[PDB]
Design a protein around this motif. Structure first.
Motif, PDB file in Angstrom:
ATOM      1  N   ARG A 257       3.770  36.650   0.394  1.00 27.33           N
ATOM      2  CA  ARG A 257       4.543  35.858  -0.649  1.00 27.33           C
ATOM      3  C   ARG A 257       4.558  34.026  -0.771  1.00 27.33           C
ATOM      4  O   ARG A 257       4.796  34.642  -1.713  1.00 27.33           O
ATOM      5  CB  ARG A 257       5.926  36.831  -0.411  1.00 27.33           C
ATOM      6  CG  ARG A 257       6.210  38.449   0.657  1.00 27.33           C
ATOM      7  CD  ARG A 257       7.064  38.474  -0.069  1.00 27.33           C
ATOM      8  NE  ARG A 257       7.637  40.148  -0.626  1.00 27.33           N
ATOM      9  CZ  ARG A 257       6.674  40.966   0.019  1.00 27.33           C
ATOM     10  NH1 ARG A 257       6.257  41.425   1.384  1.00 27.33           N
ATOM     11  NH2 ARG A 257       7.580  42.033  -0.607  1.00 27.33           N
ATOM     12  N   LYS A 258       3.602  33.816   0.033  1.00 26.67           N
ATOM     13  CA  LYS A 258       4.367  31.909   0.330  1.00 26.67           C
ATOM     14  C   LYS A 258       3.588  31.703   1.291  1.00 26.67           C
ATOM     15  O   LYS A 258       2.951  32.212   2.300  1.00 26.67           O
ATOM     16  CB  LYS A 258       6.251  31.907   0.749  1.00 26.67           C
ATOM     17  CG  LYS A 258       6.018  32.222   1.652  1.00 26.67           C
ATOM     18  CD  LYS A 258       7.985  31.584   1.354  1.00 26.67           C
ATOM     19  CE  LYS A 258       8.492  31.966   2.907  1.00 26.67           C
ATOM     20  NZ  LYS A 258       7.915  31.617   3.204  1.00 26.67           N
ATOM     21  N   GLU A 410      -0.609   5.301  11.127  1.00 26.01           N
ATOM     22  CA  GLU A 410      -0.075   6.512  10.675  1.00 26.01           C
ATOM     23  C   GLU A 410      -1.342   7.688  10.276  1.00 26.01           C
ATOM     24  O   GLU A 410      -0.971   9.115  10.860  1.00 26.01           O
ATOM     25  CB  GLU A 410       0.467   6.603   9.059  1.00 26.01           C
ATOM     26  CG  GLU A 410       1.247   8.135   8.702  1.00 26.01           C
ATOM     27  CD  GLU A 410       2.420   8.139   7.622  1.00 26.01           C
ATOM     28  OE1 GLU A 410       1.558   6.908   6.469  1.00 26.01           O
ATOM     29  OE2 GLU A 410       3.599   8.022   7.670  1.00 26.01           O
ATOM     30  N   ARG A 444       7.860   8.234  14.169  1.00 27.93           N
ATOM     31  CA  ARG A 444       7.596   8.831  13.025  1.00 27.93           C
ATOM     32  C   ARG A 444       7.211  10.268  13.191  1.00 27.93           C
ATOM     33  O   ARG A 444       7.303  11.338  12.222  1.00 27.93           O
ATOM     34  CB  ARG A 444       7.863   8.133  12.045  1.00 27.93           C
ATOM     35  CG  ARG A 444       7.877   9.081  10.880  1.00 27.93           C
ATOM     36  CD  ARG A 444       8.335   8.224   9.139  1.00 27.93           C
ATOM     37  NE  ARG A 444       9.686   6.745   9.951  1.00 27.93           N
ATOM     38  CZ  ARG A 444       8.737   6.098   9.007  1.00 27.93           C
ATOM     39  NH1 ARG A 444       7.879   5.058   7.939  1.00 27.93           N
ATOM     40  NH2 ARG A 444      10.400   5.038   8.970  1.00 27.93           N
ATOM     41  N   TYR A 447       8.262  12.705  15.267  1.00 24.65           N
ATOM     42  CA  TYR A 447       8.838  13.345  14.889  1.00 24.65           C
ATOM     43  C   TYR A 447       9.021  14.760  13.548  1.00 24.65           C
ATOM     44  O   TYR A 447       9.483  15.544  14.114  1.00 24.65           O
ATOM     45  CB  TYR A 447      10.011  12.657  14.228  1.00 24.65           C
ATOM     46  CG  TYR A 447      11.096  12.907  14.095  1.00 24.65           C
ATOM     47  CD1 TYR A 447      12.367  12.770  14.334  1.00 24.65           C
ATOM     48  CD2 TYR A 447      11.463  13.259  12.266  1.00 24.65           C
ATOM     49  CE1 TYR A 447      14.000  13.559  13.996  1.00 24.65           C
ATOM     50  CE2 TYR A 447      12.810  13.318  11.884  1.00 24.65           C
ATOM     51  CZ  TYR A 447      13.611  13.843  12.868  1.00 24.65           C
ATOM     52  OH  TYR A 447      15.079  14.113  11.584  1.00 24.65           O
ATOM     53  N   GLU A 448       8.190  14.765  13.501  1.00 22.04           N
ATOM     54  CA  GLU A 448       7.752  15.486  11.711  1.00 22.04           C
ATOM     55  C   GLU A 448       6.797  16.542  12.342  1.00 22.04           C
ATOM     56  O   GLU A 448       6.954  17.808  11.982  1.00 22.04           O
ATOM     57  CB  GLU A 448       7.305  14.581  10.736  1.00 22.04           C
ATOM     58  CG  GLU A 448       7.137  15.480   9.824  1.00 22.04           C
ATOM     59  CD  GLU A 448       6.542  14.818   8.667  1.00 22.04           C
ATOM     60  OE1 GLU A 448       6.872  13.736   8.199  1.00 22.04           O
ATOM     61  OE2 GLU A 448       6.162  15.280   7.096  1.00 22.04           O
ATOM     62  N   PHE A 449       5.847  16.093  13.170  1.00 14.61           N
ATOM     63  CA  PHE A 449       4.571  16.770  13.351  1.00 14.61           C
ATOM     64  C   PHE A 449       4.695  17.613  14.892  1.00 14.61           C
ATOM     65  O   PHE A 449       3.284  18.130  15.184  1.00 14.61           O
ATOM     66  CB  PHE A 449       3.043  16.508  13.364  1.00 14.61           C
ATOM     67  CG  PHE A 449       2.943  16.067  11.211  1.00 14.61           C
ATOM     68  CD1 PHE A 449       2.545  16.799  10.670  1.00 14.61           C
ATOM     69  CD2 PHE A 449       3.554  15.041  11.468  1.00 14.61           C
ATOM     70  CE1 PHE A 449       1.805  16.318   9.183  1.00 14.61           C
ATOM     71  CE2 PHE A 449       3.153  14.614   9.785  1.00 14.61           C
ATOM     72  CZ  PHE A 449       3.102  15.378   8.819  1.00 14.61           C
TER      73      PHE A 449
ATOM     74  N   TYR B  31      13.145  17.484   5.842  1.00 14.66           N
ATOM     75  CA  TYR B  31      12.013  16.874   5.348  1.00 14.66           C
ATOM     76  C   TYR B  31      10.939  15.926   5.425  1.00 14.66           C
ATOM     77  O   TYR B  31      11.224  15.614   6.115  1.00 14.66           O
ATOM     78  CB  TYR B  31      12.706  16.389   3.465  1.00 14.66           C
ATOM     79  CG  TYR B  31      12.990  17.644   2.901  1.00 14.66           C
ATOM     80  CD1 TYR B  31      14.712  17.920   3.241  1.00 14.66           C
ATOM     81  CD2 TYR B  31      12.724  18.308   1.636  1.00 14.66           C
ATOM     82  CE1 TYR B  31      15.228  19.527   2.414  1.00 14.66           C
ATOM     83  CE2 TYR B  31      12.942  19.310   0.875  1.00 14.66           C
ATOM     84  CZ  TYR B  31      14.106  19.335   0.840  1.00 14.66           C
ATOM     85  OH  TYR B  31      14.597  20.794   0.544  1.00 14.66           O
ATOM     86  N   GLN B  33       9.416  12.526   6.332  1.00 10.25           N
ATOM     87  CA  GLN B  33       9.182  11.388   6.416  1.00 10.25           C
ATOM     88  C   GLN B  33       8.435  10.583   5.614  1.00 10.25           C
ATOM     89  O   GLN B  33       8.235   8.942   6.522  1.00 10.25           O
ATOM     90  CB  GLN B  33       8.872  11.265   8.286  1.00 10.25           C
ATOM     91  CG  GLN B  33      10.204  12.241   8.795  1.00 10.25           C
ATOM     92  CD  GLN B  33      11.783  11.803   8.979  1.00 10.25           C
ATOM     93  OE1 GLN B  33      11.801  10.671   8.896  1.00 10.25           O
ATOM     94  NE2 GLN B  33      12.644  12.298   8.878  1.00 10.25           N
ATOM     95  N   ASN B  66      17.547   8.708  12.708  1.00 11.08           N
ATOM     96  CA  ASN B  66      16.521   8.881  12.884  1.00 11.08           C
ATOM     97  C   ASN B  66      15.308   9.598  11.483  1.00 11.08           C
ATOM     98  O   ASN B  66      14.345   9.122  11.294  1.00 11.08           O
ATOM     99  CB  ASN B  66      15.967  10.106  13.964  1.00 11.08           C
ATOM    100  CG  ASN B  66      16.330   9.398  15.085  1.00 11.08           C
ATOM    101  OD1 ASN B  66      16.391   8.141  14.711  1.00 11.08           O
ATOM    102  ND2 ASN B  66      16.643  10.363  16.399  1.00 11.08           N
ATOM    103  N   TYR B 153      12.770  38.651  -2.059  1.00 11.41           N
ATOM    104  CA  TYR B 153      11.480  39.052  -2.419  1.00 11.41           C
ATOM    105  C   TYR B 153      11.459  40.605  -1.998  1.00 11.41           C
ATOM    106  O   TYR B 153      12.291  40.911  -1.712  1.00 11.41           O
ATOM    107  CB  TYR B 153      10.097  38.305  -1.422  1.00 11.41           C
ATOM    108  CG  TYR B 153       9.869  36.866  -1.786  1.00 11.41           C
ATOM    109  CD1 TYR B 153       9.164  36.616  -2.817  1.00 11.41           C
ATOM    110  CD2 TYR B 153       9.653  36.726  -0.453  1.00 11.41           C
ATOM    111  CE1 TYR B 153       9.032  35.417  -2.399  1.00 11.41           C
ATOM    112  CE2 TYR B 153      10.250  34.941  -0.652  1.00 11.41           C
ATOM    113  CZ  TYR B 153       9.494  34.566  -1.653  1.00 11.41           C
ATOM    114  OH  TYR B 153       8.979  33.290  -2.069  1.00 11.41           O
TER     115      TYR B 153
END
Lengths: 722, 354
Positions: A257-258, A410, A444, A447-449, B31, B33, B66, B153
């Motif tokens: 659904r997404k 990056e 960074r 941190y995100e991936f 969210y 970075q 962070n 949904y």
């Protein structure tokens, strides 16, 4: 389907002018030479096949490739574009472009490559024709690209070349003490054509949330990102399948659904992934498919082998790796370039990984001076149980703090992390270094991936207190020089230069031996790096032998005893010592180095010494003024029982005999042995579960007599003088 | 999770004296970075700060985290365009020690489910779906009730969020009533007693407790929720309970194994004097009567009351400067009897069963 664009291409090379060639009409107009090139490949491989250059592995021929660092390289071929249905996407995939290049399809530019170390994918759906299409890649000089930048103060004067600072290439290609200078260029990895459906899998990120090895349970997460047209929402289902050797363990289907979803799989009856010694490298096939709920047509499928494992770096308050809640003792080698012409790396991976399997390494550190290894390397480390410590591609040197380098780094970091984050063998990312690159940019990205792996911003006589009294629990780099085997000497050296002594004068190296130290540029000098071989021999054995075979045996014995001592010292001082990564296991060029095996597979004597002190259970002896301390170290999760016997080699007298119990994942003391007089060797024989093992200890203090040590080794009955 | 309100909202809060805690628009989630999201967030932050920084009701900006977004981007915007306001990077049984022994001086989020009024049920639900029980089986919600929990949904499942209503009713009143009006009254009473208890507990433990922000006052859609009033203006019973413990000066009672602690809390800068009377509802016996002095901006203890036997309700009547005020306290331990609690509420004379 996936159509391969590998095979025979057209290569046109010419000196790069003051204005680099960027277009096609410029590349075709330039006065150049045209040759048949093999892709994947390096341009020097194509030129050697054409008889244009001589073998750079022999003599001083490495310096003869110097003029080609200022050349441009024009790749061109023709491919048949497959018929695409409405909504599909045609992707042109490059696995390796070295390095700065303009990519054209049907005379239209589709991208500009600027990174040797990552893949480059282009959407050519709107620019392709019907039938045959023309693909053109105009590469320019990597060396001359450095002059487009103004270097910072701490980017100049480092061991890495100033040409390597502002560009994204492997630093060792510009020259090192263990790798030749051979910048090279070309399409060094696969080039393929991909047809993607409107519904396709962008990324499948498998992450182990928890693992209960004794309960055979595991909680796996799937962070799935897809391309999904909105008319396909609520009409596509994701099919997830976990399997082992064909048997199905879990199957989960969920309606899409997404475009992005997280699916948590609570598995039972699955085994945990362990490094070597601590258990089995249990791998399971993880497959995710996007299936139409009505027609049942499969739009895309991703398949890989994943391992259920947790990794935590405990920083002592000097660290220890924690795998599945257990503190592992890391023993392994540094991973250097497999070849100066990096298109041949994929042909060495399987055989070079076997060197670590035979060594019984449980960890490997991929040196930042090398390229990032491909997926097949990590697939091998996954199934053999070798943990991978990955440094980002930066070498001995500080780098720019400005925005341009950060953006390029990056883009590179996110690409390599997304490519590798699903391999269970990968356990650590390192910056190999206030610095923006090590403490902001790279941290960074992790941190995100990839928040499930730790990130580290930075990393004479072998019985000298500099080595002995080093207070580090985890040594990351340590090595001793070792002269290669005679067969490798005769192959890489000219006949009159095989013997190292110029004019017979012992100690003075001829020019070809000075080249293979490694001398990055062709400066005629005496001494330097090669003197480390004669210095270490002169310490242990008093005098440098003039005979070549004696010098080979003397230099290899010094490296063998020194390397074996460091491993026995670190394994023998547990639980304070937590790991040792030595340098290094294999050469990436015909060279004189501190590696324990050469580029042509020639194992030096240190390889056999190191192999006998890397066993899961190892009986060894550590020095003491009181005499000898017979210990046994265990790098497993099981207890083992055996019988050990130690006898003196020169006299045949039995010094000790008795059984032992080796507790799991710890060092256990067996007995203290009486101090023998003078110099000699003790042979250690021990049997564990019907298997015989062998080790030895050289007692006394240097200087030793070379001919006496050779008799002791031959009578020990373990290592052949060869 | 909401948009930023327009200027007219802050103009109203300015003239009515309601301080505004503004979170930046980010919801339960981490969210990016990278630079693209930071630039978009910086452009958004500067715009909303410049638009709102002149309202006196606005007192705090929050990142609702962070992190570059919460500890660099948003804090850098406040640093340059509004240094005069603080910036914060981040934010069963109601008498269970999880709620009681929570050591936070300032609670930012707390809520209990409450079934909406019958009139709102009949308006949003189809006629055959107004009654929640599918096939009459108590506990099993029909599909339309599962939709208004809220099901994001259209997945057909049983249970989930709506079970919070029957679970909280089953705790306090022992069993879930099958009759709809009884279930409405039971669910609204559980929300009313739970919400009133949290406010009386935080106001009663001053000066250690410094504030309480409960969730929430109004629904933004016809839905079954933990708000105390619906989208169509239908006030649930918790709204009237909460209103009587939000006065500037409030006489309330906090539980104690010794019995009842009659306190009075003052959220003003003035001292007030009044007379308070507490009597038992089921017996009519007067438990306490006497005057009190409520010191400004502090909690003052009035008296300790004798412990009554079993379960029941105490009605609190107090007059301050010619105005009558009313409060109550439910004593005893759950499970309570629904029909008995209803009689106590009707005889208390404060809240209508409606």
């Amino acid at each position: 389907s996936e159509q391969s664009l590998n095979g025979r291409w057209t290569l046109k090379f010419f000196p790069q002018p003051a204005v680099p060639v960027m277009t096609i009409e410029g590349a075709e107009a330039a006065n150049g030479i045209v040759v048949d090139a093999v892709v994947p490949g390096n341009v020097e491989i194509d030129m050697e096949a054409a008889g244009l250059v001589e073998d750079p592995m022999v003599g001083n021929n490495i310096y003869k490739l110097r003029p080609y660092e200022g050349y441009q390289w024009y790749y061109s071929r023709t491919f048949a574009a497959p018929v695409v249905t409405e909504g599909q996407r045609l992707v042109l995939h490059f696995g390796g472009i070295d390095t700065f290049a303009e990519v054209y399809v049907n005379g239209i530019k589709v991208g500009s490559a600027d990174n040797m170390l990552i893949e480059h994918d282009y959407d050519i759906t709107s620019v392709v024709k019907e039938g045959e299409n023309r693909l053109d890649v105009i590469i320019r000089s990597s060396v001359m690209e450095a002059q487009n930048h103004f270097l910072g103060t701490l980017s100049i004067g480092n061991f890495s070349n100033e040409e390597s600072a502002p560009v994204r290439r492997a630093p060792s290609t510009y020259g090192w003490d263990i790798m030749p200078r051979l910048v090279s260029a070309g399409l060094w990895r696969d080039v393929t054509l991909r047809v993607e459906n409107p519904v396709t899998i962008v990324d499948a990120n498998w992450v182990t949330l928890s693992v209960n090895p004794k309960a055979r349970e595991a909680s796996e997460s799937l962070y799935l990102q897809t391309r999904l047209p909105f008319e396909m929402h609520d009409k596509v289902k994701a099919v997830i399948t976990i399997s082992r050797d064909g048997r199905q363990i879990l199957r989960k289907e969920a309606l899409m659904r997404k475009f992005a979803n997280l699916f948590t799989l609570n598995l039972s009856g699955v085994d945990a992934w362990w490094p070597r010694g601590y258990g089995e490298p249990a791998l399971y096939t993880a497959e995710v498919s996007l299936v139409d709920v009505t027609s049942g047509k499969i739009y895309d499928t991703k398949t890989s082998k994943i391992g259920f494992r947790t990794v935590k770096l405990e920083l002592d308050e000097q660290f220890q790796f924690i795998i599945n809640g257990e503190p592992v003792f890391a023993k392994g080698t540094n991973w250097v370039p497999l070849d100066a012409l990096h298109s041949r790396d994929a042909s060495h991976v399987e055989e070079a990984v076997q060197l670590m399997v035979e060594m019984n390494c449980n960890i490997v550190r991929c040196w930042g001076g090398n390229v990032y290894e491909d997926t097949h390397f990590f697939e091998l480390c996954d199934k053999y149980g070798i943990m991978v410590w990955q440094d980002f591609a930066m070498g001995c040197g500080n780098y720019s703090q400005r925005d341009n380098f950060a953006a390029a780094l990056e883009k590179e970091a996110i690409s390599v992390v997304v490519k590798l984050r699903n391999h269970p063998s990968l356990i650590l990312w390192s910056g190999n270094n206030n610095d923006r690159v090590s403490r902001q940019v790279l941290s960074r990205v992790i941190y995100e991936f990839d928040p499930t792996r730790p990130y580290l911003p930075s990393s004479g006589y072998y019985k000298d207190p500099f080595y002995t009294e080093n207070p580090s629990q985890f040594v990351s780099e340590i090595g001793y020089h070792g002269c290669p085997n005679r067969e490798t000497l005769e192959r890489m050296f000219s006949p009159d230069s095989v013997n190292p002594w110029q004019n017979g004068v012992v100690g003075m190296w001829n020019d070809e031996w000075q080249t293979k130290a490694n001398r990055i540029y062709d400066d005629k000098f005496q001494g330097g790096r090669n003197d480390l071989m004669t210095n270490q021999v002169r310490i242990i054995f008093g005098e440098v032998p003039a005979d070549l075979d004696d010098f080979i045996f003397a230099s290899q014995s010094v490296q063998a005893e020194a390397m074996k001592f460091f491993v026995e010292l670190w394994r023998g001082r547990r639980p304070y010592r937590t790991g040792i990564i030595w340098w290094n296991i294999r050469d990436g060029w015909p060279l004189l180095s501190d590696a324990i095996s050469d580029y042509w597979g020639g194992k030096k004597q240190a390889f056999y010494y190191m192999q006998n002190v890397h066993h899961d259970v190892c009986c060894l002896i550590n020095p003491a003024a009181n005499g000898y301390m017979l210990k046994v170290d265990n790098n497993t999760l099981k207890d083992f029982e055996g019988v050990v016997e130690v006898k003196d080699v020169a006299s045949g007298k039995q010094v000790f005999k008795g059984k032992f119990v080796s507790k799991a994942n710890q060092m256990s003391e067996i007995a203290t042995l009486p101090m023998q007089k003078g110099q000699g060797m003790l042979v250690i024989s021990y049997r564990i579960e019907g298997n015989e093992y062998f080790n030895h200890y050289l007692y006394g203090e240097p200087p030793y007599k070379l001919d006496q040590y050779r008799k002791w080794v031959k009578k020990c009955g373990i290592y052949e003088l060869e």
